[PDB]
Scaffold this active site. Structure first.
Site, PDB file in Angstrom:
ATOM      1  N   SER B  49       0.837  -1.190   0.000  1.00 48.76           N
ATOM      2  CA  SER B  49       0.000   0.000   0.000  1.00 48.76           C
ATOM      3  C   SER B  49       0.878   1.248   0.000  1.00 48.76           C
ATOM      4  CB  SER B  49      -0.911  -0.003   1.228  1.00 48.76           C
ATOM      5  OG  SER B  49      -0.156   0.237   2.414  1.00 48.76           O
ATOM      6  N   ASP B  82      -0.730  -1.430  -4.240  1.00 47.78           N
ATOM      7  CA  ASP B  82      -2.099  -1.603  -3.772  1.00 47.78           C
ATOM      8  C   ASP B  82      -2.744  -0.248  -3.498  1.00 47.78           C
ATOM      9  OD1 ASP B  82      -4.404  -2.712  -2.731  1.00 47.78           O
ATOM     10  OD2 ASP B  82      -3.512  -2.927  -0.708  1.00 47.78           O
ATOM     11  N   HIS B  83      -3.864   0.031  -4.170  1.00 43.45           N
ATOM     12  CA  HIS B  83      -4.632   1.281  -3.965  1.00 43.45           C
ATOM     13  C   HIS B  83      -3.749   2.522  -4.093  1.00 43.45           C
ATOM     14  CE1 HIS B  83      -7.708  -1.543  -2.416  1.00 43.45           C
ATOM     15  NE2 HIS B  83      -8.541  -0.625  -2.864  1.00 43.45           N
ATOM     16  N   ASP B 104      -6.769   3.589  -7.876  1.00 45.63           N
ATOM     17  CA  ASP B 104      -8.114   3.577  -7.294  1.00 45.63           C
ATOM     18  C   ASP B 104      -8.710   4.960  -7.512  1.00 45.63           C
ATOM     19  OD1 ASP B 104     -10.510   3.148  -5.954  1.00 45.63           O
ATOM     20  OD2 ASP B 104      -9.592   3.104  -3.948  1.00 45.63           O
ATOM     21  N   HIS B 163     -16.534  -1.966   1.018  1.00 41.54           N
ATOM     22  CA  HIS B 163     -15.150  -1.566   0.809  1.00 41.54           C
ATOM     23  C   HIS B 163     -15.099  -0.220   0.099  1.00 41.54           C
ATOM     24  CE1 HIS B 163     -10.963  -1.752  -0.731  1.00 41.54           C
ATOM     25  NE2 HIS B 163     -11.493  -1.519  -1.921  1.00 41.54           N
ATOM     26  N   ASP B 230      -4.943  -8.937   3.638  1.00 42.27           N
ATOM     27  CA  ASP B 230      -4.090  -8.078   4.464  1.00 42.27           C
ATOM     28  C   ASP B 230      -4.513  -8.131   5.927  1.00 42.27           C
ATOM     29  OD1 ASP B 230      -2.443  -6.130   5.584  1.00 42.27           O
ATOM     30  OD2 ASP B 230      -3.108  -4.495   4.292  1.00 42.27           O
TER      31      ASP B 230
HETATM   32 NA    NA Z   1      -4.973  -3.724  -5.352  1.00 47.00          NA
HETATM   33 ZN   LIG Z   2     -10.576  -1.070  -3.461  1.00 43.11          ZN
END
Ligand code: NA
Ligand SMILES: [Zn+2]
Ligand SMILES: O=C[C@H](O)COP(=O)(O)O
Ligand SMILES: [Ca+2]
Ligand code: NA
Ligand SMILES: [Zn+2]
Lengths: 291, 282
Positions: B49, B82-83, B104, B163, B230
């Site tokens: 992340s 990630d994101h 994202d 989410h 995670d």
């Molecule tokens: Na991801």
């Molecule tokens: Zn997401």
């Protein structure tokens, strides 16, 4: 940059100050040590025990340090094998990229200690790697003189009364400073103090407040560390202080928020407390502002 | 060795299995993930992340993963942002050596989510890096259009998780129309033994309830190929840390805390690899 151990310690030896040699077992310890060195403008000895190397993998231990050296290229860094127990271990460390190795054969008799130390020294020097050995099952200064001359070892850890861990003294703190000075005069090389954690009062308080138990703990007084450097100590092995300060903060986070499981919320404060122990120790020993 | 994210997911898409995408913030998490992958003979998606990158430094996040790849050269490994929240973040990850980046923009309207994703895809594809995006539940025809215009490699469609209940039929529709690997976010499945470990150690979960294993199984059956994981790792890890703290107030050897924590994390990963169907796929 990453440099031969002697490069850092010969300067410390010539100018009469001490360089902390800080153990690590993972990223968080390594990062806080480096940030301390950056913040106090201090050269760094980074060391890893055989247990730490097993835990990380020697490839990760060296690899993480090389990444950190690139991140802080102005900082002199030596990467040192702490308490190597065999030739083969010291050889593996050299091959992997360590720039200093300790071979600890101090439990053997003099001739066997000197024999193995001399073998490590030849291999290591052939590879541009400096070497530490240890004498004292307390040290005999005339043995130290002969030992250093015949082995060509780069630095010596003479036993003057310390021991590893948090429980160093059942009576008054006592180190044999006259013996240290004799060793220094007869060998005229950088010397190493093992078991040099101080367990500072604030680290103790932090630990106990978080629910920890440190019954009977006693470290080397700050004044004894400073007198050690006056006596000729140039490498100052430090581990226990780092662990206690780190784990104190882990314990605190666990106590204060039972829902917390973000690892960063545990380990950011732990890194900060460890960093602060190192920064204070760099100032105490005289390596601050020596870059 | 490190490989493009899509090489791993293209195979899972073709053969209809899921690859866990496992987050790390430090060496202990990464080592346990890798050991699990070695032990289950499973390909690895390793995720970091933005917060983890800030914590490690991107140089150390990539560096540690490269070391681990060299330790286990037979394991296919993608290193995934990630994101990612901005183009500049995705670009920095590309430059540092990530082989997969997620952008994202699912909080934006379709038009704005598509233009930004499209810009990241151009940059990432120029560098040989695969791209994930997110889209929200999702309208399958909008997903069809989103994927065709953006040329993203994999899509995280909103299909029932809370989410940023599984809508199976919606999932199948998106899969049919887009015919690309799909990603499930926000579906950690706090296993019973992990929940017990955390609470036994004095931990407070309360309300934080995991989505059931059958939910993950059904989602892979629907066409999910990447399952972000995670929360479950953190709870298993910190359960053991809390336990050591409780059981020996005199313990301050870090390895005594983190060796059991690594083992618990590793076991969560091995079980998930078997559950999702990536075990024995090397
Ligand atoms: Na991801
Ligand atoms: Zn997401
Ligand atoms: O090697 C001496 C250190 O202070 C202790 O480290 P270790 O417990 O990892 O051996
Ligand atoms: Ca010894
Ligand atoms: Na040493
Ligand atoms: Zn020692």
């Amino acid at each position: 940059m990453l440099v031969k151990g002697n490069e850092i310690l010969l300067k410390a030896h010539k100018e009469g100050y001490g360089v902390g040699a800080f153990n690590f077992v993972n990223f968080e310890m390594l990062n806080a040590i480096f940030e301390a060195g950056n913040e106090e403008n201090s050269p760094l000895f980074i060391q890893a025990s055989e247990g730490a190397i097993k835990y990380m993998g020697i490839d990760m231990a060296v690899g993480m340090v090389k990444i950190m050296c690139e991140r802080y290229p102005h900082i002199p860094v030596a990467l040192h094998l702490d308490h190597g127990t065999t030739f083969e271990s010291c050889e593996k460390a050299v091959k992997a990229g360590f720039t200093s190795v300790m071979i600890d054969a101090s439990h053997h008799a003099f001739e066997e200690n000197l024999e193995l130390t001399s073998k490590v020294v030849k291999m290591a020097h052939n590879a541009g790697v400096s070497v530490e050995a240890e004498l004292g099952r307390l040290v005999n200064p005339k043995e130290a003189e002969q030992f250093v001359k015949e082995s060509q070892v780069d630095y010596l850890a003479p036993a003057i009364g310390t021991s590893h861990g948090a429980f160093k003294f059942k009576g008054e703190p006592k180190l044999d400073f006259e013996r240290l000075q004799e060793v220094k005069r007869l060998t005229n090389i950088p010397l190493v103090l093992h078991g040099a954690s101080a367990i500072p009062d604030n680290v103790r308080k932090s630990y106990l407040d978080a629910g920890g138990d440190l019954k009977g703990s006693k470290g080397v007084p700050f004044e004894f560390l400073q007198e050690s450097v006056k006596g000729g100590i140039n490498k100052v092995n430090t581990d226990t202080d780092l662990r206690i300060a780190f784990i104190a903060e882990v314990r605190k986070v666990a106590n204060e928020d039972k829902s917390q499981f973000d690892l960063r919320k545990f380990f950011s404060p732990a890194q900060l407390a460890l960093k602060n122990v190192v920064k204070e120790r760099m100032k105490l020993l005289g390596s601050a502002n020596k870059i």
